[PDB]
């Protein structure tokens, strides 16, 4: 399950794909088969013991869904944990929309249906993703949509920095999460709000209030009179898209619909939503 060797023994490391609080991701090629993979490297600390690593690796290996990037294996070498996973050729939806411009309503509908399928699985497994945003939803060359990981709980190494990162960038978090370090707590329905913000992000190239200082956003979003965000151009979008934003962005978590409930919403249960819509989007990259 966890190899005691340098990942360089089995893989040719190619370009750095990106990074963040979750670690550094590299594109790699299997030396024998020639197949491409992604390797995420995380620096281990004196508290990351192998018993805890073993426990978290078994969860990484058993949490499997078609809409979540598949785990392939792992290596622990010179205080660095490397996680081998499926390679998503087109990168994240953020990498895509920062070239193509805004996604169409149908493209957003398909992405939301695919993400809701992933979230419904994670929630049935008593997990909360807590990291839904365009940069964390990956696309392969076939137009398939996959969550980069199962969220903040998939983090082995530097978990606290990743868990607290939203405080400096809270734009995608539900009001109940933004009320950090207060009595409230939250549940899996915070993921539904984050999916609603993400649908705005794909339509507008940034989440609502992205230009506002993160500490002012935390302050406003948790005020009693906070009005949940809306799409900026009423006319460009249909009544179904406006309603999907209205219900996913319900301020009270006790009134917000579940991932399974959202899967029957008119926007995501409509005919013709398939990977072909994202193949059309990836063709825009060529020009
Ligand atoms: C939280 N979080 C966010 N991202 C991840 C990832 C992660 C990140 N990037 C990936 N690939 C990738 C990135 C960029 C591009 N370019 C294409 C051409 O335009 C420029 C961008 C291509 C592929 C992959 C993967 N599996 O392939 N995974 C892994 C783990 C956690 C994560």
CATH number of 2-86: 3.30.200.20
Q: Say yes or no: CB of residue 53 within 6 Å of ligand 1.
A: no
- Mapping DSSP to helix (H, G, I), strand (E, B) and coil, where does residue 87 land? coil
- The b/e string for 8-20 (b: 16+ C-beta within 10 A; e otherwise) is eebbeeeeebbee
Distance CA 242, CA 235 (A): 10
For atom 30 of ligand 1, the residue with the nearest CA is 148
Rounded to the nearest 5 degrees, what angle is found at the Cα of 115, between the Cα atoms of 109 and 121? 140
CB atoms within 10 A of CB 160: 9
| Residue 86 known to bind ligand | no
Query: Shortest CA distance to 29 belongs to which of 95, 88, 87?
Result: 87
Length of the chain: 287
d(CA 197, CA 54): 35
Is 18 annotated as a binding-site member?
yes
- Please indicate whether residue 85, judged by its CB atom, sits closer than 6 Å to ligand 1: yes
Number of helices (H), then strands (E), in the chain = 11, 8
Evaluate whether 266 touches 240 at the Cβ level (below 8 Å): yes
User: Would you say 100 and 285 are in contact if contact means Cβ atoms under 8 Å apart?
Assistant: yes
- Confirm if 93 and 111 have CB atoms less than 8 A apart: yes
Active site residue 283: no
Please identify, by atom number, the ligand 1 atom nearest to the C-alpha of residue 146.
26
Cα 271 to Cα 43, 48, 107, 267: the distances in Å are: 45, 47, 12, 10
Going by alpha carbons, the residue nearest to atom 23 of ligand 1 is 91
CATH number of 93-286: 1.10.510.10
68 touches ligand 1 (CB under 6 Å): no
- Domain ranges across the chain: 2-86, 93-286
Which residues have a Cβ under 8 Å from the Cβ of 212 and sit 6 or more positions away?
Answer: 220
Residue among 95, 131, 149, 191 flagged as catalytic: 131
This structure's resolution (Å) is 1.6
Q: Which of 145, 162, 157 is nearest to 69 (CA)?
A: 145
Q: Quick one: DSSP state of residue 266?
A: H
Rounded CA separation 111/285 (Å): 18
DSSP state of 92: B
Identify whether the C-beta of residue 173 lies closer than 8 Å to the C-beta of residue 224. no
93 lines ligand 1 (CB under 6 A): no
């Amino acid at each position: 399950d966890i190899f005691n060797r340098d990942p360089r023994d089995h893989y040719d490391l190619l370009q750095r794909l990106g990074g963040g609080t979750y670690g550094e991701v590299f594109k790699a090629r299997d030396k024998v088969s020639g197949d491409l993979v992604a390797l995420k490297m995380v620096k281990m600390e004196p508290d990351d013991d192998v018993s805890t690593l073993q426990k978290e690796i078994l969860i990484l290996k058993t949490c499997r869904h078609a809409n979540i990037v598949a785990y392939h294996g792992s290596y622990l070498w010179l205080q660095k944990l490397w996680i081998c996973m499926e390679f998503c050729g087109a990168g994240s939806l953020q990498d895509i929309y920062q070239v193509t411009g805004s996604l169409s309503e149908l493209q957003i509908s398909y992405v939301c249906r695919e993400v809701l399928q992933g979230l419904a699985y994670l929630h049935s497994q008593k997990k909360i993703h807590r990291d839904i945003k365009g940069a964390n939803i990956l696309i392969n060359d076939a137009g398939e949509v996959r969550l980069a990981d199962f969220g903040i709980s998939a983090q082995i190494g530097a978990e606290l920095a990743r868990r607290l990162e939203f405080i400096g960038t809270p734009y995608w978090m539900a009001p109940e999460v933004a009320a950090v370090a207060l009595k409230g707590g939250y549940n899996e329905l915070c993921d539904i709000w984050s999916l609603g913000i993400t649908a705005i992000e794909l339509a507008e190239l940034q989440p609502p209030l992205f230009d506002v200082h993160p500490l002012r956003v935390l302050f406003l979003m948790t005020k009693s009179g906070y009005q949940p965000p809306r799409l900026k151009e009423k006319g460009k979008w249909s009544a179904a898209f406006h309603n999907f934003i209205k219900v996913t962005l319900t301020k009270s978590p006790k009134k917000r619909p579940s991932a399974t409930k959202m899967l029957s919403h008119q926007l995501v249960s409509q005919p013709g939503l398939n990977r072909g819509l994202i193949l059309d989007l990836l063709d825009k990259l060529k020009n």
